[PDB]
Symmetry: D2
Subunit: 299 residues, 4 copies
């Protein structure tokens, strides 16, 4: 059954069992849901109410523009013509950009700086706990993620409607995350997040004040396939969550990722610079003919 | 209570009462819901299933493009990033364009030609019934709508998600329709359509296999304010309709609209060409300075 | 012949003749070209080189994105597929926004603050010179433009290619400017700006280090038709200017514009709040039915 | 010096020398310019005048929309705000779509059907001439391009302004064409097309009534590197061409491309299905993690 982990229990006598759940989650699920994670409910509830406030502003503004755009063509804009989807990204590390993102309150910007510093601390704690389970030095993964300027840490803030009906959302393509460790905060209890475990869809159980954690492709490389990045997809439920803060703690652009030499005995995962993996992901690496001829010879 | 009108009863002994409901609806509601309207359930159910099929194709295509667009920026497209709103228009009269609209099946195009001819016949029947209640010649409104080339008749086909939550949709601007007579076919029974009667929102009652009819600004002019066009808005409900075919039967561009001289005794509504009203609606009429100076002198 | 005015000559013995040219320009041309205007060539040449630098960055960035967008569809982006047009606005008064506009250098932002303060001083000087020619109190127009928070002052920065060929640009719609006083700085000497004087197109003569000034609709109201806002259009020449900084000094949103009572003897121009004129200009004023019925009755 | 080839001379006594020029062009230039190519000047001049007519319609329409869009925001659209770039594609083989492309005259559609049939005949002639020079069977390349349904043949029609200045266009990325054989028809004599021969830019010489031909990546594979696809880019000149019809004759999606076994003695170019090469080109092939791990191991 799905790993739900009370993170505070790692401080007390039930540490061995809690670290075991994390080990089990990392090896067999690629995902776990955290509660009692050292981020107050007051802080999370602030983030929710404020983000929903910003969203409400954007939709009232968007409708005024739609009515004007549509009226230009001699057509009445209905409320049913609304694009309810809104998403924007907030970079934190190595260079923050919360001061430069358009159309935010100063008190909103300040709470997201507070939210980001809290999350990188949680992210870095979890990586240390992983380091311990793997039998590795403290801060090995933080070190490996660093590169020169430091690790890439940012947050995708999204607000969205429910899906019109399930059968449309069926047959949609899933993915594994290319990054390092990914921390999802949502409103409600129902995430609408599904894992593809043994050919079948398992829903992430609903939990209030939770943070859902999962491991990306980079940690699979570093652990030499031991902690695998798992196939998944998020879908908006009819009476579930309609707000998602997805914070990605990835390696820095120039960080050289490779399997930790300790975790290699008797195939071997590759060595590469993180930006090149992301450049492959975005289709930039085969923009000339000679590379394409290499690739077609390999196949 | 809201006028629900069985149109077949106009053929039988209960005609007087049915015409009375239409008169009451036209004068005090500006809206009525038709059942038994001479369009088979089989024909409507075909239109629904086929349109939803086309919509499903567009969303699977749209997601493939989104995943590719987002991957270009080194970002994973989630299903929650989907724009579920899709809308396109089908002109019928005076010049049909169902053959030229991109990405439709031939069997779909053919059903919409069949659907359009059925609706203009219903539209023109209703106008005659209105002519009778007003004490006017048969086909007076059809005549008045004609102009030179004939009346404008088309259909807005829309598919959309539910609204994330009510409080966002609250405070949204309502309208009266600028056109002639407007016929709304929907799936489900719940329209999500609201009238603004005496300062308060009244929902259009849910009815299966119904066509909701309402009168636009042009009929108010022609009736000299007797049949007023009513304030309204449509909002997508959480478990209501998610498909809307809104067919507008408006006057032709060059049609001269004015109050029928019979309906004038002891202020008088204006005379104008329909295209000029629509050019005013779209803000094209005050594109030069001299017109603006006229308007500011009037205020 | 077109009014070219050396502004420094207003300090010396040739003031009467220079003020006469301004009077003539304001009454019979609606336009004049300033030289020796109290903005150093060094300051203007800085603005040019820096803005062209920012533009070059945007086009290299835009092409990288186009190549990626087009490659997504299995198509090679040619250089001939480039959208060379780029335009952005910089608000100065009442609230500056040069700090918040994306993708600018700090040294660029700082020069535009310096450029803006210089131009509002020039703008306000010219309005005083107009006040003198009209026989009005010093700062009357600045006062009238103020409202509550102060006048609207901003700058449209544009970079663009030449027009493919003249015959495409022929038959294009001209305008008068809705605002107050409009100050155009360009690179090159050839503006590509044309006036519509007595039914015929007159080119603004080419002059290096010039600022082209023209009067908008608001000054025509305030002068009771004496200083008329003139029809014009700007067109990119094959070997002329390819950069335009158009700074608009308009009245504040809440400023009540009306003909100065001194300038009224034996029709009278209207009184209105500036925002309402701009709301009429944008087609927002006839978004409901009752207003439209007023307008159609007037016609 | 650049290969300019009179194609009619292949019928007469000067055939050996003309075929030698084609061999030289194919081996050392990857490009040649055809004259007297069996497409009348009357037919080409029709294509030019008609396409420019369609373009003029689109720009007058685009400006009307821009003026309305910009006026919505309380801003005057200048002619200098125009996006002059317009481009659309016309599929011919295996399935024509000239009947379905929006906003074309019937007489325009018909001329493009006539133009397409002429070009595929020219394309297939040239491939036979190449087959002869390579020492291959007649129609070997046409056969190899076929797959199941037949070869992909279409035409990119583009209209565009000149580049604002050269130094912006400098440092822009060049390419080789991924397709088969590519035939460029232009107005004017100046193409603005440049080859990257021995590290340096060579302009394609200006010639009236010419068709510029070049070889893509697929022909390099089939010839086992003998006929190489050459680096190039097209740039709009200040007083050169402003219209480009680029017709691509590529292999069919399912066509298996590989080096002709005759042309292999003592590295070997790869075998692949054409769609997979184009799927690699568009970045779709590394959308999952396992493929990316293969690619990073190879590097
Ligand atoms: Ni994910
Ligand atoms: Ni409506
Ligand atoms: Ni202007
Ligand atoms: Ni090319």
């Amino acid at each position: 059954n799905f790993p739900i982990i009370s993170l505070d229990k790692v401080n007390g006598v039930e540490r061995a069992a809690t670290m075991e759940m994390i080990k089990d989650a990392c090896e067999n699920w690629g995902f776990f849901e955290l509660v009692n994670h050292g981020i107050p409910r007051e802080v999370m509830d602030t983030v929710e109410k404020m983000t929903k406030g910003h969203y409400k502003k954007c939709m009232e503004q968007r409708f005024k523009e739609l009515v004007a755009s549509k009226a230009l063509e001699g057509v009445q804009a209905e409320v049913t013509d609304m694009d309810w989807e809104s998403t924007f990204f907030l970079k934190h590390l190595p260079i923050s950009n919360i001061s430069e993102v358009p159309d935010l309150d100063e008190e909103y910007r300040e709470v997201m700086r507070d939210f980001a510093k809290r999350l990188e601390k949680l992210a870095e704690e979890l990586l240390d706990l992983l380091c311990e389970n793997l039998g590795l030095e403290k801060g090995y993964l933080k070190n490996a993620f660093y590169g020169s300027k430091g690790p890439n840490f940012g947050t995708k803030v999204s607000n969205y409607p429910p899906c019109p009906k399930p059968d449309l959302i069926k047959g949609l393509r899933a993915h594994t995350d290319a990054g390092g460790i990914i921390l999802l905060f949502q409103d409600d209890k129902v995430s609408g997040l599904q894992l593809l475990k043994d050919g079948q869809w398992i829903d992430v159980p609903p939990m209030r004040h939770s943070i859902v954690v999962n491991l990306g492709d980079q940690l699979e490389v570093i652990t030499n396939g031991k902690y695998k990045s798992v196939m998944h997809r998020v879908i908006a439920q009819k009476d579930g969550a309609r707000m998602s803060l997805a914070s990605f703690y990835n390696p820095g652009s120039d960080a050289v990722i490779y399997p930790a030499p300790a975790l290699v005995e008797k195939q071997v995962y590759p060595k590469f610079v993180f930006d090149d993996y992301m450049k492959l992901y975005a289709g930039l690496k085969f923009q000339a003919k000679e590379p394409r001829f290499e690739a077609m010879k390999a196949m």
